[PDB]
């Protein structure tokens, strides 16, 4: 790279080299690393911003700790760009977030300097304790350290971890990256130090050096500048939801909406401002969000849990045990359903149509466009026999016309086109492509609307009038909606070939949503090819 | 029981004179003859206007006295005095602040009180609940039945004697008009699969230094008592924290050890995200010993390990094994333990094993089922411990019988071979039919466009009620006679 523009950064290709530089040279390095971050990564990545706040902390860590031998763990990892830059990926940083480029967050297979693959938050301390325990048994003096944000240390996990750490007392350092006190951490069993200036590299080095050597659970609380923030993980469906939320809240006082620290992402900013008394941000606590909704439901209100498909994974037990078993009519507005894009593997809303389907009493809806979305939220909100869910992708609507809200009959699909030989059953926002395939193959097209309960009569009807069925969904094929269709046919002993089109059995790689959907054969062309190969 | 006899409703309890209450506790305590919440239960129903005021018990395992003055745990559909249906722990505070906020907006002065044990306050969801309450500050009382909070946002009171009936009454009454979140701290006083698991653990821990066994507060339940005593340095009880349990295992694997997470199928539901994000995505070889898989019996809907094979199955890189007997179980534990390319799981039911011969440990080829009987027209694919019954059906209908062994990856060749060899297939599993093992079988046949009819036998789409395992299995048709009857009717379609 521009060796003359960054004379000091140039002297670092590995942390080993970095540890060779003299202390007084570090402040200058930090300046070059900060400028380099702003000059090489596409601003379209947003996370470069979160990285800015850890520049000094990262240099201090790799200078004091013996990495990659010592184990460094970043929570979430959206703040690890400088970490990647200082660990042999300086000249590859410009490709981060892109298809075939560096991972959006630390990834174990990408580098020996990445100890834990992260994306969801609050996992650092737990894995960290496991790592420190192994290091202690190893007996080679391997050191452990975790960097966790003020927001991430909000999850129950973090508490379970810290409480456990407080008991077995492993030699490890937990660094609180506070960019928004210590009594709690001391009560939990940690030796607390801070708050400290997180942008004083030399000050952090001498502090880190001392604590790296101390025994037992150590906790350093630092403060970093938050900056202007970053973008969260035809109107978007998030805005559709938000708008519906506001208008519904104005109609009746029973609406209560909850988010686990994703107000903006789920499109609830305007809502939270106009109805502060109907809004709840439980912090990064998906588990409490759901059971809190149960309580509200029990108390006679109508709770709505706004949660991403990927994060809803952490509240599975509350959904099933605290809401489903009790038939509590909680409405789940699941955003980021399907492939989410740049965030990659750790954030795909690839499994909700499966893990939710095996749950008794659960009603699962999948809108094909923004009007259907509104109608289903409406239906879900007025469905009081149990829990209901409406899932939608990250992205813009199709631009359809919006009709007056009307409850949709539960478990009923609707044929959109009458064809021959082939009947394509669509579940979700992949409809536009499915529509192209049907028109191109003169096949029958059905918008299933409900994943559960399934419109069995309609399935049986399509099977009886066609040679083969094709199911389309943006979710894992295994256990998903198509799988549900197969189950119905098998039960009635009407074995009609069914091609289940959906997500393959591997975690979906990062890239553009369009770019990744095409690569997986989830577009008109790709789908027709699959059908061709299958029939062949 | 002269004092208790005068109590058939909590309204009658409130009519009695204070001085009489202590005698009631002694009687109530002898009637039962858990008994450690007698004094508190009375105090609460005596001071609070229940069932108008909402009383929430965490876990419910110790709600017997509560039920007398009023299912194994409090169930909303049973009584109106059971505000929240429980089973799993740490839900009280969570649903409770939800109920407190509702009561706040209702404006009818309805009170909210949650009773939680010291074990339940170790769960991550209790931490999230208290934090949130300390923020929005709803009017409510959390009672810690002990047999930091001020830092979370609560006004702490105590400690106080939990066995002093009149004492608790006075205190509860004194806190009547205290606003915001209040916290009252009181002080109170034939082999089974679980067995083969524990023995296997001890045996294995004696062969290497890598094994590490973790449990989220269920030592005896998972039959690990012996192991904890013989290999204290390989045992880890992380309290009621399923999430941390799994991610802690991930860390042990990253460090070079071979972690084994011993957890109930129901509770594993609470660590779903850690299993998927912290183990599967990193392809870390953690082994999961899933106990109480299938119908557990007396514990009811809140403890049924019924979705086990459905939620793990959609996860990429996951290896799922379903022992048909105790010998298979040890082979699979051994296999899963030495499978280093990713996470593996071995699920087994609560209760006694079949009584088969135990053969020396040997690795099983991943994703390979085995044909046990070759019949005609029908091929029965078994997944799990319902095999004895499935075998009876096989002999009765002269059907081919196969022990699939793996739920994932499935033995596709065997499935395609069987489908080509018969007119129909029948899958048997003690898991929800929807998204289960058999469902996976359907998927293979369809992907190959070889649609032979398949009869998926498993648990129905409703939470199954409490009752002995045999009773529930016979009632659901997971009986030999029930299965055969199901097959006949299915073929009669
Ligand atoms: C379990 C989980 N829930 C939600 C998210 C979405 N998320 C990603 S970043 C973030 C906030 C993290 O806050 P903090 O650790 O203080 O870092 P900061 O946002 O200040 O950069 C959230 C909610 C997540 N990654 N994981
Ligand atoms: K509802
Ligand atoms: K293993
Ligand atoms: Mg922060
Ligand atoms: Mg207790």
From Swiss-Prot, chain A:
Stored PROSITE patterns: TRANSKETOLASE_1, TRANSKETOLASE_2
Reaction catalysis annotation: D-glyceraldehyde 3-phosphate + pyruvate + H(+) = 1-deoxy-D-xylulose 5-phosphate + CO2
pH-activity relationship: Optimum pH is 7.5-8.0.
Keyword terms: Isoprene biosynthesis, Magnesium, Metal-binding, Thiamine biosynthesis, Thiamine pyrophosphate, Transferase
Source organism (scientific name): Escherichia coli (strain K12)
Function in brief: Catalyzes the acyloin condensation reaction between C atoms 2 and 3 of pyruvate and glyceraldehyde 3-phosphate to yield 1-deoxy-D-xylulose-5-phosphate (DXP).
Protein name: 1-deoxy-D-xylulose-5-phosphate synthase
Gene that encodes the chain: dxs
Superkingdom, taxonomy of origin: Bacteria
């Amino acid at each position: 790279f521009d060796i003359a523009k960054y004379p000091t950064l140039a002297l670092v290709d590995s942390t080993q080299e970095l540890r060779l530089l003299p202390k007084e040279s570090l402040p200058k390095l930090c300046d070059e690393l900060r400028r380099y971050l702003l000059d090489s990564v596409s601003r379209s990545s947003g996370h470069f911003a979160s990285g800015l706040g850890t520049v000094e902390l990262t240099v201090a860590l790799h200078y004091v700790y013996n990495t990659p031998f010592d184990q460094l763990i970043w929570d979430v990892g959206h703040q690890a760009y400088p970490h990647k830059i200082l660990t042999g990926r300086r000249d590859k940083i410009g490709t981060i977030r892109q298809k075939g480029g560096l991972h959006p967050f630390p990834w174990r297979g990408e580098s020996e300097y990445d100890v834990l693959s992260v994306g969801h938050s609050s996992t650092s301390i737990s894995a960290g304790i496991g790592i420190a325990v192994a290091a202690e048994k190893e007996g080679k003096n391997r050191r452990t350290v975790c960097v966790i944000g003020d927001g991430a240390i909000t999850a129950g996990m973090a508490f379970e971890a810290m409480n456990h750490a407080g008991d077995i007392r492993p030699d490890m350092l937990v660094i609180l990256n506070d960019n928004e006190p210590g009594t709690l951490f001391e009560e939990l069993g940690f030796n607390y130090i801070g708050p400290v200036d997180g942008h004083d590299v030399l000050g952090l080095i001498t502090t880190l050096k001392n604590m790296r050597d101390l025994k037992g659970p150590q906790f350093l609380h630092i403060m970093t500048k938050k900056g202007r923030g970053y973008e969260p993980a035809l109107p978007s469906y998030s805005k559709i939801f938000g708008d519906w939320l506001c208008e519904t809240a104005a109609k009746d006082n029973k609406l209560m909406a909850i988010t686990p620290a994703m107000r903006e992402g789920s499109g609830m900013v305007e809502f939270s401002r106009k109805f502060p008394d109907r809004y709840f941000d439980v912090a990064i606590a998906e588990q409490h969000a759901v059971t809190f909704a149960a309580g509200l439901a029990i108390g006679g209100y109508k709770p709505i849990v706004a949660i991403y498909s990927t994060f809803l994974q952490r509240a599975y037990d509350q959904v099933l045990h605290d809401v489903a078993i009790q038939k509590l009519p909680v409405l789940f507005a699941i955003d980021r359903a399907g492939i989410v894009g740049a965030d990659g593997q750790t954030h795909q809303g690839a499994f909700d149509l499966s893990y939710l389907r095996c749950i008794p009493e659960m009603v699962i809806m999948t809108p094909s466009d923004e009007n259907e979305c509104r109608q289903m939220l409406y239906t879900g909100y007025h469905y009081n026999d149990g829990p209901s869910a409406v899932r939608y992708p990250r992205g813009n609507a199709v631009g359809v016309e919006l009709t007056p809200l009307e409850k949709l009959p539960i478990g009923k699909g609707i044929v959109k086109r009458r064809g021959e030989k082939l009947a394509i059953l669509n579940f979700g926002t992949l409809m536009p492509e499915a529509a192209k395939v049907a028109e191109s193959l003169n096949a029958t097209l059905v918008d299933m609307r409900f994943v559960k309960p399934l419109d069995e009569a309609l399935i049986l009807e399509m099977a009886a009038s066609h040679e083969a069925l094709v199911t389309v969904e943006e979710n894992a094929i295994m256990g998903g909606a198509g799988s549900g269709v197969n189950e119905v046919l098998m039960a009635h002993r009407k074995p009609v070939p069914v091609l289940n089109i959906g997500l393959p059995d591997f975690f979906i790689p990062q890239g553009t949503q369009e770019e990744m959907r095409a690569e997986l054969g989830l577009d008109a062309a790709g789908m027709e090819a699959k059908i061709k190969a299958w029939l062949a």
